[PDB]
Amino acid sequence: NLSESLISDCDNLGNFYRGPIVLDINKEFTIEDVPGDGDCFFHCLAKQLPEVSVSRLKGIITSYALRNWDTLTEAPRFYSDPKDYERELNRAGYWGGTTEAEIINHSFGVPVVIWTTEDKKLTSAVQVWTRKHGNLPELHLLHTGTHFMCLAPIV
């Protein structure tokens, strides 16, 4: 259940893949609650990036958006320009999600896999950014209700 194994069951939607995939969360994954002031996205990914704190992650994302707006898709769809995005992203209560997942994928190069669940027991869908460069281990998340948890395939 790493990124490349999932995409044949997804649609290729350009900058990411997405597909309905229904897996038993308790049977297939380990999941972890991580606190946060927003929706837990940044703490979850800071945990999975061992040399990167929450504040450093936001700084990397901010810089990447300022310098790579022409090659991003999600942030430019929802924000007028990188300055507008920087102002919102850097509020303490900002809710992270797919917009930052793309920036993390492009900046660190790492695959990002976000599973969604509607009933908290089975997944309903997965969204996948495939590797862009480097050899960092994949970042996986579960999006449940209005928050994110860390996720890893059971070994």
Q: Are 149 and 34 in contact (CB under 8 A)?
A: yes
Number of domains in the chain: 1
Q: What is the resolution of this structure in A?
A: 1.5
Tell me the technique behind this structure.
X-ray
> How far is Cα 65 from Cα 96, in angstroms, rounded to an integer?
14
> What is the domain range of residue 12?
1-155
Among 5, 29, 44, CA closest to 123: 29
> How far is Cα 128 from Cα 7, in angstroms, rounded to an integer?
7
- CA dihedral for 53, 84, 103, 145, sign (positive or negative): positive
Phi/psi at 89 (5° precision): -55, -35
> How far is Cα 95 from Cα 88, in angstroms, rounded to an integer?
9
Question: 143: which residues sit within 8 A by CB, 6+ positions away?
Answer: 97, 114, 115, 116, 117
